[PDB]
């Protein structure tokens, strides 16, 4: 199974109409697989959706006595609905290492603690962030009638995006957090796949060196994360990297040959390890000085010659409403990454890369 993937993060509380477009764009360009987000954490991230997942600790849904609000765990269960008629495969992810949909800190917040790494430490942050992923992979879908834990359109759990512990530079706090959580997820659910969702970072591997010598901090462990080390835990089934060099601090001259080298020192790394990977997440801004289509072929190619299970962009969007419609209609390019289905050098490009996956 290899694929050509992509990332949507508002399948959990946008309309109906917004969903459908999404996932029948995926189905029309070919993308296999759409890596969505599971959570949204907090009060205030809650009533800005009007969408209610974890507003507070051991609360799941919408709060007692809140009326007109949607509740997130009903939207998921029509993506994955949808997603299931249109053969669409998710990826969903459990928390977030950023504030956005409330992350780590809005549990850091609930807890009293005093740092966002404080989420892997604290045993009672652990505790909630176990009840909440327990609640969710034991949720009924109401479209379907499947629990999610046996629903086979969602290809794997992931435990955080884009996971960081830069408190702990030798890379111990984040292995013994993954060992934790993917096997609680083993023990609630022994059908799916368990990953990460981190960016991939390395920690000071031996002959391992940025191409350029720029973005060092993301081969030289600073993140706190040691990718070799968590994918060699056994409860961990594939590797996931990330991608995006104008972010981290590359030259634009620099992106395509930056991203080939990371792409390729993945791929060597996790078939020596002997598990899959998969490059979740990549991005070059709109407006960078480069062909952007081309660097998208290059990665492309690299992955599929060698080896690589699958390459997702960051990210799909489709049709918009409301405060989110741009001058065409659609959900609004707000970061500069949005592809969509239309006559775009890069839509075009993965159509064509659809086909050979």
């Known amino acids: 199974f290899r694929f050509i993937g992509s990332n949507n993060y508002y399948m959990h509380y946008k309309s109906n109409r917004?969903?459908?477009?999404?996932?029948?764009?995926?189905?029309?360009?070919?993308?296999?697989?759409?890596?969505?987000?599971?959570?949204?954490?907090?009060?205030?991230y809650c009533r800005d959706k009007n969408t209610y997942m974890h507003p507070e600790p051991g609360v799941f849904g919408v709060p007692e006595g809140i009326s007109n609000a949607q509740n997130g765990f009903e939207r998921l269960d029509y993506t994955i609905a949808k997603a299931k008629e249109l053969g669409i495969k998710?990826?969903?992810?459990?928390?977030?290492?950023?504030?956005?949909?409330?992350?780590?800190?809005?549990?850091?917040?609930?807890?009293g603690g005093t740092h966002h790494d404080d989420f892997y430490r604290d045993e009672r942050i652990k505790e909630e962030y176990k009840k909440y992923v327990s609640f969710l992979i034991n949720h009924v879908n109401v479209y379907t009638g499947v629990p999610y834990r046996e629903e086979p359109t969602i290809m794997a759990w992931e435990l955080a995006n884009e996971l960081r512990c830069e408190t702990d530079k030798s890379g111990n706090t984040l292995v013994e957090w993954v060992?934790?959580?993917?096997?609680?997820?083993?023990?609630?659910?022994?059908?799916?796949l368990v990953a990460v969702g981190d960016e991939g970072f390395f920690s000071?591997?031996?002959?391992?060196?940025?191409?350029?010598?720029?973005?060092?901090?993301?081969?030289?462990?600073?993140?706190?994360?040691?990718?070799?080390?968590?994918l060699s835990i056994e409860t961990v089934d594939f590797g996931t990297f990330h991608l995006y060099p104008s972010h981290w601090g590359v030259s634009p001259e620099n992106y395509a040959q930056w991203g080939a080298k990371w792409i390729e020192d993945?791929?060597?790394?996790?078939?020596?390890?002997?598990?899959?990977?998969?490059?979740?997440?990549?991005?070059?801004?709109?407006?960078?000085?480069?062909?952007?289509?081309?660097?998208?072929?290059?990665?492309?190619?690299?992955?599929?010659?060698?080896?690589?299970?699958?390459?997702?962009?960051?990210?799909?969007?489709?049709?918009?409403?409301?405060?989110?419609?741009?001058?065409?209609?659609?959900?609004?390019?707000?970061?500069?990454?949005?592809?969509?289905?239309?006559?775009?050098?890069?839509?075009?490009?993965?159509?064509?890369?659809?086909?050979?996956?």
């Open 18 to 44: 917004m969903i459908d477009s999404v996932l029948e764009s995926a189905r029309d360009m070919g993308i296999k697989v759409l890596r969505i987000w599971g959570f949204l954490d907090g009060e205030s």
């Open 90 to 111: 998710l990826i969903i992810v459990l928390v977030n290492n950023w504030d956005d949909f409330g992350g780590m800190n809005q549990y850091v917040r609930w807890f």
């Open 179 to 192: 060992k934790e959580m993917s096997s609680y997820i083993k023990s609630l659910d022994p059908n799916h």
């Open 204 to 230: 000071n591997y031996e002959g391992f060196k940025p191409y350029g010598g720029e973005a060092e901090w993301a081969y030289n462990g600073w993140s706190g994360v040691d990718w070799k080390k968590l």
């Open 266 to 357: 993945h791929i060597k790394i996790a078939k020596e390890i002997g598990k899959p990977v998969v490059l979740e997440e990549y991005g070059i801004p709109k407006s960078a000085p480069v062909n952007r289509t081309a660097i998208y072929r290059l990665w492309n190619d690299l992955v599929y010659d060698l080896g690589g299970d699958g390459a997702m962009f960051w990210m799909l969007a489709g049709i918009g409403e409301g405060s989110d419609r741009d001058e065409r209609g659609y959900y609004p390019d707000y970061d500069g990454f949005r592809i969509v289905n239309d006559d775009s050098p890069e839509a075009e490009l993965i159509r064509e890369y659809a086909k050979l996956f």
